[PDB]
Structure formats: C-alpha cells, structure tokens
C-alpha cells in the first residue's frame, strides 16, 4: 500500500458564481462570491466590499441562489453541490461569533438518469414556493419549499423535451411557471409550462411555443412591470410574452458570444450583458404606457459601455458599481459612469482581485538563488493571458506579466537567463484574405521577431477554404527575460500549426542549449492530426536560430529529455531520438501500445506514459538492447489529465473527473503477470482539475530547516487557480493522521451537513469508491482552528504506534505541535 499527504497551498481563485441579496441581515446588501468549494460573503459599502465571512464546503458549488420565503426576516441561501448534495443555509451572528446554520439538507441524486449537456440548472420560484432543478435529460425535479421539508425530499415530472438549453421561473403568473429554450431536430424553441405542486405534473403553459434563434443560449426572466422573458443568442435578442414579440439584432453583438446577464433596475428596465471578448453592454427596455394605465414593452436597445475582464458572472451592486466575476482572468470592481471618458468608455476599473486563472503549465525555478524557489505559471486565456511569478513571504507574493494572448507551456533556460513560453492568439479572417488580430499582444510586441519558413508541408494540394469572420489560432514561441519579464523574441509558427510541447536542454555531445518545440498541423477536417514538426531552436545574441527540424506523422503532444536523448510522444507512438554530430535527430526506438500518448515523465531509465483513456504505463529504456520494454500498466481505465512520478515505485495521476490516483508496481515477482500489473493503491477525489504536476517547493530552505515527517514535494496547478502540494508519509505517520481525521470528522460541523468521507470518495459518473492512501491535509490543518474543548475531545484515547513508544496517548498540545510542523510545508 502507499501513503501520501495532499494540502492546498493556494485556494481556488476563479469566480464560478456570484449573487446579491440580504443574507447576513435583512438590512445589509450582501455579495456572495462562489469559488470552487469556497463561499465568500461580503457586505457592500460606498468604497467597495467589506469581507465578513468565508466558509468551505465539502463539495463543488453548482447552484447558489438567495431567496426569502414568507415569514423569514432575511434571505436564505440554497446551494447544490456537483455530487448532488443540497442544503438550505442561514447566517446567524451572536456578537463576535459568526456561524452558518444548516436548515435543511439532503442528496437529490437519482438512481437512473442521463446527465444533461448544459449542466445542472437551479432556479427558485418568485413566490419561493419551490426549487426547480434540471439534473437529467427528460426530467424536471421539484423540491417544494414547505416548512416541513427539512430533508429536501423531491419528485420528478416527466419532461417531453429531452434537450433543454436554459430555464427560468417567470414573473407575473397565476401559477408557478417555467420558461425554457429547448432543442430538437427542427431547431430551437421557447416553450412554457405551469408547475402544480398539488398534481405533481406540468399543465399547459401561459403562452405558445415560438421558434427562436438556432444558438439561443440564455433565458432572462423579466420582472412584473413588463413580465415575460428575454432570449439572448449569438446574433439576436428577443422578447416574448403571449402575443407580444420583439427582436433586436444589432451587428455589434454578432462579433462575440454573450455569456452572462444581470439586472440593473429591479423593475426590468435595464439589464447588463457581457461577451467572451470582455465587452460589457447595457440592454435597455423602452417603456410605453397606454391610456389604459397598462405598461408595455415598446422596444429594445443595446448600448456598449466599455471593457471588463471576460466574466463568468456579473452582478450590479449599487450606485455605479458592478462586480465582475472572472474565471479566465482577474475579477473586478468597475464603476459605470453616466458620462463617457475621452476614449468613449463609460467603464473605469476600481479594484482588481487576483485570479490565477487556468494554470495551463508551470515550472519552479530559483531565480534569485534564494534556495526558496519561485513558481512561474502560465495563467489566464485570451486577453487575460498572463505569466504569474509566485513566491512565499503569512501570504503569497504574486507578480503578473500581461500577455493579452493565451499562454500554453513554459520552460526555463538558465544559460540564457530567460524563459521560453508557448502562446496562441486569435486572429480573424479579414477581407484581404489574411487575418487580423483583435488586439496587440505579446507575440506582436516582441523586440525582435521571426516566422518559420519551413518547406516540410509546403507541397500541400489539400484545400482548406476560409470564410470571412472565422477565428484562427496563431501559435508562437516567446523568449522572455527572467528579470524584466520583457518579450525579447517571438517566433511565429506555420499557418495552422499548433505548438503542443516545449523543452530546454542539451543533447548528446552538443554543448549548445536549445529550445525544442513540438508542433502539430491542425486542420478542421481531421479528427486527429496526421502531420507535425519537432523543431530545434537556439536562442543566441537576441535572436532565435532554427537549428534543425524533424517531420513526424502526427501531433507531438509531449516531450522530455532522456539522458542526452529526446523522448517525444507522437500520437500513439512514444519515440526516442538521438542527437547526431550532424545536428539532426535520429530515430532510435519506438513504442506503439498507446491509444494517444498525452503525457510523459522520466526517472532514470524509466518512463511514464499517460494515455487519453488507458491510465498510466510504466516503460523502461533498456540500454543493452537499444529499445523499449513495457514494465507494468494500470489496467483499470481512467481518463488522464496530468501525471507525475513520485518515486521508483509510486506514480501519481489526475483524472478528468477531478479525481487523483496513485499506482505502484506489485513488487512481487511470483508470476510475471503480477509485476506487469500496476495496482491503484491511492484514490482521492480532490475536487479540482489538475493540468500540471511539477516537482519543487516554495518554502525557504536555509539547509537548516527542520526536515518534516512528510517526504518529497510535488506541486500541482489546476483550472480554477488552486495550487496544491502532494507528499509522502511513512506508514506510522499515515495511520496516525488517518485515525485523527476520523476523530476530527466526528467533531467538526460541516456546512450543509455534508459527510467528509463522501466528499473525498473517488467518484465518476459510473463509479464511487472510498478514498484510500491519502490524508486530507486541509482537514488535518483545521485542528488548529477548532476550539479547545473540541481539541481535547479529538485526542481522547488517541495512542501512538511503531515509535520510540509503541503506545503513547497524545494530548491536545502534542497534536498542535505536529500539525504546526505540517503547516510549514507550504
């Protein structure tokens, strides 16, 4: 068996949702920001936000909504986790003591059902009579909000429309009414139903179905003064309400997809809209009052306000202040002005909240020779693309290098006092027949620049037609100085060439240090690329020289230096190249029992290959023979997102279901088959999507720092900005910390009353297993924050083993010291 310890070094920073209401008091204006597994509660002031409370939940927050049922003084909070844990929460404050109440809770998972494409949707009735959930295709689940439903019991109503895009409860209806957009073979439609709690079924809805735009994406529930709904698409915005129908199709929105909406004026006059290019719009509802005294919707207008970060959620707070919740870039407070500035913008940034964004790749390097080590991450996407230099100093110090294009891979080249960074920027087919970039970015603002002139694929004769307005990716290699972080050089790769892998190394007997990039020829027609290049560059005297190029029949997904040789994975093949005295790559050996070789890692003469669906494979280079040997493979099937070698026997992997596993060689040679079987001995749910595993630690080392019981250091980066650390334990230390977890879980009160053991259970759509071989470091570290009565309750009857003393019951002070040492690993 194997024993490991995982701790969160930096919490998730990306904003996954945000709502406003009256949650902490019926009087205050609150902003609740949801980051993966984390809830942040703020109070709105005239200058910005006053933080008041932050809690963690044992689950990914999927639905977050505030509502106020009749009889309550203040808003209640509904949350549903991605594993279908539902709860209703209340804020309660006693002087200085702040706690969160679990008013109702339960798990709403169905034994049988098909998870929907557009994900979990949760909505609440304007009269707060029920909670609507769209979890499975063809089913609508209703949790009625009666006082007695403390377990959140619910029923399903059969829904004929199998493929639903979005749904909202409507305002101004005689009965609870849902309005939704759905897709069938004839296109997309908007349709209504009424929800009867008494009959537990749908009844005919207030207004007829209307055919809507093919890419109709979002449903906006208009308030009582107008009523009805608004439907946002790629080209058009439409208003529907019985006999009334409006449509505005302003050319400005066709340019970028609109992803988020919020209401500015409670009466529905003004709504905010944002798009993937970061533009912020105002949608205006122009009113017309008839002599009847009735108020109707006259027309819709769209007005461009300015630019914000690409935003997952928008929420208007008060006055001119809007909170911009960003998942791909830094989140913001911005102020909307009535008068535009001299550039024509009505939006002016107030504050910027650091978001490490998607961490596509990262490397740990000691820049200042401090021995502390600094972490440089490829963070953000598109305009928010950035390099982030992170050091420990008690908070983490983070520096941001704006790139305004997507960073893909990073590697450090000390000989050149610089970094190599792979990047891509979006250009659009223009009237010249070429393409034009939407904005300048790192690859265009380099001091010196170059473009590949390779003739390898120039024979072509394969047609790829271009339509004006279509997007293309332009991939580049950036040379960036390690002190100034100034773009010294940008190399633009071939048209339709995507850069996938990057290394910096010396090969063979060649004393020069090279940047080597693996690329793939990507054409929309191909499901898998059939062409590629391995390119050897030298960065010398401010210029990048093309040294050599090797043509491969596929995509060079991953590369890694292997004892003076170049190990590269091309599609299904893992291939080792030698670097000749003629400065050209030479094929040595190949391996082909791979569906798609996505990730490579090396230790000694051993190699670990991560397949798209075949888990991990342990290979070995046999120098006596000049070929590869399959040592052992993990037959259990998992989808791989990132891998890492822990030691010669333990191997770490990341599943696309946000799960983590560790396999080990069976080390029992009884039968050859046992050795060729990798047994998964560690299973952990984690809750985040790992892209990059990287050996290293950020802790300052003076060579005198007490060696912690934990041994080894692997840092990992994730899509939501969370950075964690994986380390190994001895059997004795694991058993102790594990026994302590079970004691802590009985003591610590969970938000939503979610069992910790369930949260960490390895979980796929198909399987659920109890965690094994992993210690939740964050649970262990919370021991220091629980009250003294609870600490002593935890240590009761807790004895030591396999130590200097074989049985030695610890005290609350003994454990405080142990955990405090464990907090010094990050």
């Amino acid at each position: 068996m194997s024993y490991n310890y995982v701790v969160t070094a930096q919490k998730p920073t990306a904003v996954n949702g945000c709502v406003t209401g009256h949650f902490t008091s019926a009087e205050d204006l609150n902003l609740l920001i949801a980051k993966n597994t984390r809830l942040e509660i703020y109070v709105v002031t005239a200058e910005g936000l006053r933080p008041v409370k932050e809690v963690g939940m044992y689950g990914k927050i999927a639905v977050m909504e505030l509502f106020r049922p009749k009889g309550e003084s203040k808003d209640l909070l509904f949350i549903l986790t991605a594993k279908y844990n539902a709860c209703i929460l209340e804020y309660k404050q006693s002087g200085e003591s702040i706690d969160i109440i679990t008013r109702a809770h339960g798990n709403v998972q169905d034994r049988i059902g098909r998870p929907s494409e557009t994900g979990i949707i949760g909505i609440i009735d304007p009269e707060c009579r029920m909670i609507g959930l769209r979890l499975y295709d063809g089913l609508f689940k209703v949790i009625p909000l009666d006082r007695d439903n403390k377990e959140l019991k619910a029923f399903n109503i059969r829904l004929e429309e199998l493929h639903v895009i979005d749904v909202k409860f409507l305002y101004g209806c005689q009965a609870p009414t849902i309005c939704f957009v759905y897709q069938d073979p004839q296109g997309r439609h908007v349709k209504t139903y009424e929800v009867s709690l008494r009959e537990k079924e749908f009844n005919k809805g207030p207004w007829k179905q209307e055919n809507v735009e093919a890419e109709a994406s979002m449903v906006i529930a208009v308030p009582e003064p107008f009523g009805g709904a608004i439907i946002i698409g790629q080209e058009s915005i439409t208003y529907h309400n019985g006999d009334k129908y409006l449509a505005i199709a302003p050319p400005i929105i066709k340019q970028s997809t609109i992803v988020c909406h919020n209401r500015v004026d409670p009466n529905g006059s003004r709504y905010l809209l944002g798009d993937m290019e970061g533009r912020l719009f105002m949608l205006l509802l122009e009113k017309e009052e008839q002599m009847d005294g009735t108020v109707t919707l006259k027309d819709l207008r769209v007005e461009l306000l300015g630019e914000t970060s690409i935003a997952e959620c928008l929420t208007y707070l008060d006055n001119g202040v809007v909170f911009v919740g960003s998942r791909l870039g830094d989140s913001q407070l911005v102020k909307l002005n009535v008068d535009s500035n001299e550039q024509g913008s009505y939006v002016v940034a107030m504050e910027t909240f650091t978001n490490l964004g998607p961490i596509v790749d990262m490397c740990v390097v000691d820049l200042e020779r401090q021995g502390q080590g600094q972490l440089v991450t490829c963070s953000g996407a598109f305009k928010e693309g950035s390099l982030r230099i992170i050091r420990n100093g008690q908070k983490l110090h983070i520096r941001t290098v704006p790139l305004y294009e997507s960073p893909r891979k990073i590697c450090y080249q000390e000989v050149s006092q610089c970094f190599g960074v792979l990047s891509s920027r979006i250009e659009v087919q223009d009237t010249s027949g070429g393409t034009t970039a939407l904005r300048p970015s790192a690859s265009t603002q380099a001091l010196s620049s170059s473009v590949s002139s390779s003739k390898l694929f120039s024979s072509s004769t394969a047609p790829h037609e271009t339509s004006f307005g279509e997007e293309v990716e332009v991939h580049n290699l950036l040379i960036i100085d390690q002190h100034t972080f100034e773009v010294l050089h940008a190399h633009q790769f071939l048209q339709n060439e995507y850069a996938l892998s990057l290394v910096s190394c010396k090969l063979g007997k060649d004393p020069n240090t090279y940047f080597i990039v693996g690329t793939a020829m990507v054409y929309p027609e191909e499901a898998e690329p059939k062409q590629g290049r391995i390119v050897v560059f030298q960065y010398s005297d401010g210029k990048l020289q093309t040294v050599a190029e090797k043509e491969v029949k596929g995509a060079v997904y991953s590369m890694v230096e292997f004892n003076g040789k170049l190990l590269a994975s091309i599609n299904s093949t893992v291939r080792l190249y030698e670097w000749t005295t003629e400065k050209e790559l030479r094929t040595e050996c190949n391996h082909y029992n791979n569906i798609m070789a996505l990730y490579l890692k090396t230790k000694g003469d051993f190699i670990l290959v991560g397949d798209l669906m075949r888990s991990v494979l342990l290979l070995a280079y046999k120098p006596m023979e000049g070929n590869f040997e399959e040592i052992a493979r993990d037959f259990n099937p998992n989808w791989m997102s990132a891998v890492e070698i822990l030691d010669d026997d333990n191997f770490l992997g990341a599943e696309n279901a946000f799960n983590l596993f560790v396999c080990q060689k069976d080390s029992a040679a009884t039968t050859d088959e046992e050795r060729q079987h990798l047994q998964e001995v560690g299973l952990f749910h984690l809750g985040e999507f790992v892209n990059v595993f990287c050996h290293g630690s950020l802790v300052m080392q003076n060579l005198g720092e007490t060696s912690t019981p934990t041994q080894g250091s692997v840092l990992f980066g994730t899509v939501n900005g969370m950075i964690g650390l994986v380390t190994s334990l001895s059997e004795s230390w694991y058993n102790l910390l594990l026994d302590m977890q079970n004691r802590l879980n009985k003591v610590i009160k969970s938000v939503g009353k979610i069992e910790h053991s369930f949260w960490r259970s390895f979980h796929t759509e198909r399987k659920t297993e109890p965690a094994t071989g992993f210690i939740d470091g964050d649970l262990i570290e919370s021991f220091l924050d629980i009250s003294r009565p609870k600490m002593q309750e935890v240590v009761a009857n807790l004895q030591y083993d396999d130590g200097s003393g074989m049985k030695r019951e610890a005290t609350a002070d003994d454990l405080i010291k142990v955990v405090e040492e464990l907090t010094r690993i990050h």
């Binding site: 169905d110 034994r111 049988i112 059902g113 098909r114 998870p115 499975y136 295709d137 063809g138 089913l139 059969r158 829904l159 199998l162 793939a520 990507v522 191909e526 499901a527 898998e528 690329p529 995509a555 997904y557 391996h591 082909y592 029992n593 569906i595 798609m596 996505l598 798209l612 669906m613 075949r614 399959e630 493979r633 037959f635 099937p637 998992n638 989808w639 997102s641 696309n656 088959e673 060729q676 079987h677 999507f689 892209n691 899509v719 796929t764 759509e765 198909r766 399987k767």
Partner: protein, 327 residues
C-alpha cells in the same frame, strides 16, 4: 495447410504490448510479420499442471471454431512457443490463441465518458449484438458472461462478442444442472441471483438489456456488491419477484431466503421516461423478471427499435478525437 493449428510458432508475430490480463493468461497485442495484420494473442499456460490445459480455453477453442458471425470474434489460429526439441516432458512452453484485434472495448469507452451515443448509434450497436447473440442462441450455445468489457468495438462501428470462456450448450429437452453464479453481479439476471442452476438462454438477454439501458444513461443500471443488494436494486426498478409476475418464483431455491425490503411496483417506464418509446419497450421486455416471459434474441431483432435498422449504415460512434483531448 491453414487448418494445422498448434504448430506455427509465435515467432511469426512481433509483439507490440500488453492489452490486458485475462483468465488463463495475459493477452498481448501483436503484428503478423508476414501480412502486417494486427492480432491479439491470448496466452495459455499448461505449466501449472494442476488440471492441464484450462477448460476455459478449451471452451473458447471448441465454440469459436464453430461460430461464424460478423458480430462474434474470430479465433484466427493457435500458435506456440519454441518447443523443446524431442523432449515433450521437459517442454512447458505456453500456447497462444490468436484473435483479431478490435480497437476498443465498450467498458473502456464508457468509463472515459468521451463517447457520445446517439439513438442511431445504439440501434446499430444493439442490432449487431442481438444478431450475434441470436446466431449463438440458434446454435444452442449460451455466453453466460455478458459484460461491457466483453463487447469489442472497432472504430468502424462493428461490434464483436469476446469472452466465451464460460460458454456452454443449452438443451431444452434435458434440463442440466449448471453453475449458479456465471454473469458478473452488475449484469447478472435475477433468476440466477435466486439460484435457478437450470437457466435458459434468457440470462444473456437480461444482461444485454442492462447494456441497452447503460448506453442511454452512460451508467450501469444495477450496481451493487452483494447478491441480495442487486435483487433490491433490480426489484426497485423491475418490480419485486412475486408469484403473479413470476409464477414459478416459488420453486427457486432462495425465493423465501432472499427477499427485497418491500414488494416494489414496476417503475421501469417512469424512471426511463427519457428513453425513446421504441427502445423503452425493448427494455421492458428484455428486463422481464420471469425468464419464460422475457423476450428472445429474435424478438428483439423483430422490434420497432431494431427491425428497420440497416446494417449497411453502421453509424460509427463519436470516438474521442484530438479536440476531445483538448480542454
């Protein structure tokens, strides 16, 4: 001649890697040196000398050399390790069962969740499986181990049945005592949970229905670890075993012994409302508690869901592509 099995050496294949660990030995993918055709070689070890050649392999050799079908896997030949010269008693070299290499297996594709089955894809997939099952059932052979893992699928969209290790002949006239526990618990029929021991070909039909539902939900329908627990899950959806729905349930050994918590009513149509009507009927019949009332393989092929499916259009599934790898 092509018919002289057991003599050609495994030298004739250049092994690529290991594709899985089987029951009598590991199975390694390999390339034929002479033709280039990819094959998968199942290793059979007689070195154990406990009972000699595994009967599991003997069954697969006997049955698959009889069965010829597009949807049933082909044993191309049997090859051997370099045998010891003129000393059979010292010889302990293994034997290999060469089969065609099918690119992927359904359990693996579903586990990644990358694949997205449409109704038409399922139609093509289910039609082949049922046609293959019908051929085998008409030849009076029972598979007895129907699992997602034992369903191999080329990228082309062709399906083939695979592990005939537990397969045996069925005699309608003479009831024969068989092995109670054969199919994996997740796909095992209810009759065998209660231990019929004298089971019909309908046991394979039950599993294929569990597969049919699985393709629609992207999740095995009945997942449990204990035989009684499976009966409960099956009972919740298909209804509790009772004399009215299963007149002969009382004769089954464990009927009194193994009981669900309640006498649950059948809810299959309700819990599967999302499934298309044509397919939902197929599921209700395939997941019928009483083996005598459970549909046959031919009846599934003469269903509205499958009868008008044309095998000319195989409907290749959405197999994971490079953009599918991209996040």
């Amino acid at each position: 001649t092509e018919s002289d099995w057991g003599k050609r050496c495994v030298d004739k294949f250049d092994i690529i890697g290991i594709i899985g660990e089987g029951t009598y030995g590991q199975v390694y993918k390999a390339k034929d040196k002479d033709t280039g055709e990819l094959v998968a070689l199942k290793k059979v070890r007689l070195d154990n000398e406990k009972e000699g050649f595994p009967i599991t392999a003997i069954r697969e050799i006997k049955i698959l050399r009889q069965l010829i079908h597009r949807s049933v896997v082909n044993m191309k030949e049997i090859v051997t390790d370099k045998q010891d010269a003129l000393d059979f008693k010292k010889d302990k070299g293994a034997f290999y069962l060469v089969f065609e290499y099918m690119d992927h297996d359904l359990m693996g594709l579903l586990e990644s969740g990358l694949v997205h089955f449409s109704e038409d894809h399922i139609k093509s997939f289910m039609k082949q499986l049922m046609e293959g099952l019908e051929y085998c059932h008409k030849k009076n052979f029972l598979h007895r181990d129907i699992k997602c893992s034992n369903i191999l699928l080329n990228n082309s969209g062709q399906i083939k049945l695979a592990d005939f290790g537990l397969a045996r002949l069925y005699n309608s006239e003479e009831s024969r005592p068989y092995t109670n526990k054969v199919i994996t618990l997740w796909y095992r029929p209810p009759e065998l949970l209660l231990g019929e021991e004298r089971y019909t070909p309908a046991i394979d039909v039950w599993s294929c229905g569990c597969i049919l539902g699985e393709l629609f939900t992207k999740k095995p329908i009945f997942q449990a670890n204990l035989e009684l627990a499976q009966l409960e899950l099956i009972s919740r959806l298909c209804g509790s075993p009772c004399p009215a729905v299963w007149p002969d349930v009382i004769r089954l050994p464990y009927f009194n012994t193994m009981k669900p918590k309640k006498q649950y009513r059948r809810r299959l149509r309700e819990e599967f409302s999302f499934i298309p009507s044509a397919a939902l009927d197929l599921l209700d019949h395939m997941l019928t508690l009483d083996p005598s009332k459970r549909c046959t393989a031919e009846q599934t092929l003469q269903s509205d869901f499958l009868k008008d499916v044309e095998l000319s259009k195989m409907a290749p599934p959405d197999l994971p592509h490079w953009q599918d790898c991209h996040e």
